Amino acid sequence: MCLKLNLLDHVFANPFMNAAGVLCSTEEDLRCMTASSSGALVSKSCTSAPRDGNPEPRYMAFPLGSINSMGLPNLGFDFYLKYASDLHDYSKKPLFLSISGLSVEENVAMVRRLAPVAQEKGVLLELNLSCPNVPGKPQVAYDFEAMRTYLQQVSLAYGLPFGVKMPPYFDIAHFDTAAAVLNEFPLVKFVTCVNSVGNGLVIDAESESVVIKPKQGFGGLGGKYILPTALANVNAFYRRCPDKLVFGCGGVYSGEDAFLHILAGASMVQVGTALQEEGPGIFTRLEDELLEIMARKGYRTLEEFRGRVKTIE
Amino acid sequence: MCLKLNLLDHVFANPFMNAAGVLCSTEEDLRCMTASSSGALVSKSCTSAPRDGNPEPRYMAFPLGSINSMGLPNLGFDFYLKYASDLHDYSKKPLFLSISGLSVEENVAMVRRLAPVAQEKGVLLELNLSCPNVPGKPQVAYDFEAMRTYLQQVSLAYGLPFGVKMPPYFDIAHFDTAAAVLNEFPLVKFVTCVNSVGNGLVIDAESESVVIKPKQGFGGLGGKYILPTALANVNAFYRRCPDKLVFGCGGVYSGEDAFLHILAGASMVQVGTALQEEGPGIFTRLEDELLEIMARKGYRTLEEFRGRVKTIE
Numbered sequence: 052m053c054l055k056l057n058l059l060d061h062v063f064a065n066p067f068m069n070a071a072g073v074l075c076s077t078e079e080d081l082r083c084m085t086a087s088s089s090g091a092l093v094s095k096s097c098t099s100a101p102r103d104g105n106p107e108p109r110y111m112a113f114p115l116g117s118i119n120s121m122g123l124p125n126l127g128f129d130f131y132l133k134y135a136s137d138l139h140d141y142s143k144k145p146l147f148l149s150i151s152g153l154s155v156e157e158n159v160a161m162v163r164r165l166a167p168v169a170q171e172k173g174v175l176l177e178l179n180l181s182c183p184n185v186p187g188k189p190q191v192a193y194d195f196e197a198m199r200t201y202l203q204q205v206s207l208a209y210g211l212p213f214g215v216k217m218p219p220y221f222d223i224a225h226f227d228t229a230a231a232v233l234n235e236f237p238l239v240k241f242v243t244c245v246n247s248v249g250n251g252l253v254i255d256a257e258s259e260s261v262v263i264k265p266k267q268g269f270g271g272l273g274g275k276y277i278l279p280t281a282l283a284n285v286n287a288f289y290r291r292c293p294d295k296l297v298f299g300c301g302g303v304y305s306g307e308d309a310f311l312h313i314l315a316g317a318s319m320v321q322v323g324t325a326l327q328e329e330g331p332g333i334f335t336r337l338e339d340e341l342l343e344i345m346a347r348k349g350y351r352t353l354e355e356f357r358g359r360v361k362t363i364e
Numbered sequence: 365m366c367l368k369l370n371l372l373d374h375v376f377a378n379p380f381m382n383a384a385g386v387l388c389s390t391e392e393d394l395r396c397m398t399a400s401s402s403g404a405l406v407s408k409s410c411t412s413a414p415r416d417g418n419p420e421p422r423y424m425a426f427p428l429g430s431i432n433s434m435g436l437p438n439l440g441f442d443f444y445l446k447y448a449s450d451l452h453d454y455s456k457k458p459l460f461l462s463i464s465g466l467s468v469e470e471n472v473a474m475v476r477r478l479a480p481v482a483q484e485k486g487v488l489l490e491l492n493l494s495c496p497n498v499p500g501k502p503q504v505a506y507d508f509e510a511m512r513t514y515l516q517q518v519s520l521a522y523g524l525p526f527g528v529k530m531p532p533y534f535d536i537a538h539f540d541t542a543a544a545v546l547n548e549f550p551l552v553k554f555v556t557c558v559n560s561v562g563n564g565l566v567i568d569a570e571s572e573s574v575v576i577k578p579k580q581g582f583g584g585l586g587g588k589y590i591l592p593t594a595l596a597n598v599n600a601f602y603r604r605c606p607d608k609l610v611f612g613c614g615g616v617y618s619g620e621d622a623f624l625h626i627l628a629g630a631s632m633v634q635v636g637t638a639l640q641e642e643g644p645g646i647f648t649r650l651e652d653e654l655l656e657i658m659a660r661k662g663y664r665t666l667e668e669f670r671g672r673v674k675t676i677e
């Protein structure tokens with residue numbers, strides 16, 4: 052019985068990793084994730100220049116999940132590239148680097164410089180397509196023409212296999228269209244579903260106030276709120292992108308939640324809110340819990356059940 | 365006490381009603397909602413002809429909410445019109461009739477017939493814009509040019525104040541576009557936010573199976589999963605449509621949840637999943653709970669706090 056995976060020409064001890072943005076912003080964070088029992092790690096989505104991000108409070112968690120409008124605080128691309136080129140211990144586990152430029156040009160500039168490090172050290176790119184583009188237009192993955200432009204430009208500039216981080220969709224026509232755009236790009240080898248459910252609003256009844264300061268309290272939702280949404284997206288893209296891997300993200304708190312993601316199609320399984328709340332010890336727990344479900348069912352490997360969710364009649 | 369309010373030229377004993385689709389399909393259902401303590405009721409969204417809807421199982425509930433792909437089973441427009449015209453007791457409470465035709469023409473045909481009954485009896489129209497669209501396109505409310513056409517045609521055909529049931533949105537640019545569309549139509553006097561969060565997927569770990577038969581287990585989510593989504597949409601439209609009313613729907617299980625909807629801007633508060641699970645007794649509980657929270661805070665009216673959610677700075 053084992054959790055091993057071999058994919059994207061890397062070996063992973065288990066499918067668990069952080070979700071971008073959680074426990075991955077500083078060198079301290081990345082050393083911490085490297086020391087944990089996760090199978091991989093991803094660095095904080097970066098911009099060319101460092102960002103402070105939004106005013107605090109900008110993240111809050113609750114029993115059913117989290118809300119955030121962080122504003123992309125990060126130490127800048129050069130820092131993350133340095134970590135990938137010089138600091139990361141690749142004998143411990145594989146590293147993904149997430150990028151999230153504010154324009155197609157900012158992304159092209161980053162990927163051009165990443166590429167030799169990707170080639171030499173094996174760092175893997177995750178391109179975050181929730182980047183805002185022009186304010187007053189939707190986020191890039193909700194503007195299909197922009198998404199196509201971004202992927203054309205990044206594919207030409209980078210020239211190596213990479214993956215994309217997608218927001219959730221809520222309409223079958225959007226699953227269809229979004230997957231068809233991704234399927235135009237053979238270098239897109241993995242699809243991470245999902246980023247946070249956009250622009251929710253948590254209100255505290257006692258104070259009669261929103262709980263985060265930016266955007267009048269509106270921000271992206273993670274956690275237990277979003278698990279069925281995340282599963283839907285994992286499976287929609289699993290079905291529509293048969294030549295790509297799907298990584299699942301959203302609502303993972305337990306080995307059972309991971310097992311559902313993997314039934315839906317997930318290869319790697321990312322952990323955001325639950326990791327933010329519990330800390331890196333969560334990885335040993337998730338591994339144990341997943342293995343126990345596998346033993347009960349008689350499953351010896353992940354591929355025995357990946358994508359094998361049953362439908363009714 | 366008491367929670368009585370006036371709107372749309374009608375008096376309501378309290379702000380609570382069923383959500384369309386729940387406990388409102390048959391004459392029995394509508395008599396049961398009328399006998400309840402709710403302040404109003406809404407009939408099941410209808411088509412010109414009766415529909416059997418999708419194969420069962422097509423609804424399932426769980427601790428955090430519900431998933432459905434009902435396929436609009438309904439007794440047909442003639443039935444609901446006859447209920448509004450001949451059977452409903454208007455001395456007990458107001459009635460809303462929901463329509464969701466499969467094309468603009470079908471909506472126009474239904475609303476031309478409804479108009480005289482609305483004049484004579486005061487039945488209120490809720491137009492459900494989560495309805496099918498032309499090939500390749502998403503649901504009408506997700507296609508802003510279709511939505512505008514539908515509202516143009518229904519406004520002309522009906523000629524009387526009505527409301528619109530909206531799906532959730534997840535992007536601030538979409539809130540801006542959708543609200544601008546609604547604000548073109550002066551006859552649209554109330555906006556109900558939100559319909560179910562579209563195309564989630566619930567998977568049962570033991571069986572390794574989806575839990576509803578239609579659409580490979582994909583369906584709309586309601587209940588606790590969707591409360592922050594619902595609040596965000598209520599507040600977004602409340603802010604953007606100052607000359608309209610907003611009705612809140614989504615994730616109401618308690619008077620506290622109703623309180624939060626009202627703080628966000630809700631005039632009426634609709635109850636779907638929790639009503640399906642608990643039955644019509646829920647209405648006395650919600651009223652008692654809401655009045656208890658108001659008393660603890662010193663609020664004597666709903667107007668004192670409707671839309672008064674506080675932001676940080």
Ligand SMILES: Cc1cc2nc3c(=O)[nH]c(=O)nc-3n(C[C@H](O)[C@H](O)[C@H](O)COP(=O)(O)O)c2cc1C
Pocket residue numbers: 070071072073095096110117119121123149151179216245246247272273274275277300301302303321322323324325327
């Ligand atoms: C504080 C915070 C920061 C985030 N920053 C990023 C980011 O920089 N890039 C990204 O792709 N997603 C980001 N996300 C989204 C997470 O990666 C993840 O997609 C989302 O939280 C859902 O997973 P969960 O339900 O496990 O939280 C962030 C989420 C949180 C809570």
Ligand SMILES: Cc1cc2nc3c(=O)[nH]c(=O)nc-3n(C[C@H](O)[C@H](O)[C@H](O)COP(=O)(O)O)c2cc1C
Pocket residue numbers: 383384385386408409423430432434436462492529558559560585586587588590613614615616634635636637638640
């Ligand atoms: C079984 C079922 C049937 C529904 N039918 C309709 C419908 O006919 N028309 C409609 O506008 N919404 C319909 N909905 C959506 C609800 O009105 C409501 O918007 C949704 O369930 C979110 O509220 P909740 O969190 O209270 O469940 C239905 C929901 C359920 C669960």
Ligand SMILES: O=C(O)c1[nH]c(=O)[nH]c(=O)c1CCc1cccc(C(F)(F)F)c1
Pocket residue numbers: 072096119120121122123124151153179181182183246247271
């Ligand atoms: O940093 C974030 O707010 C964030 N939060 C998430 O839940 N997921 C994400 O992908 C991100 C980063 C993307 C993002 C999301 C919202 C705003 C901006 C900004 F404009 F600041 F550049 C960037």
Ligand SMILES: O=C(O)c1[nH]c(=O)[nH]c(=O)c1CCc1cccc(C(F)(F)F)c1
Pocket residue numbers: 385409432433434435436437464465466492494495496559560584
């Ligand atoms: O009956 C539904 O499945 C349903 N469930 C919801 O959570 N919200 C809804 O608004 C609806 C009805 C959506 C709808 C609206 C109009 C037509 C049709 C079709 F005939 F295609 F089944 C479906």
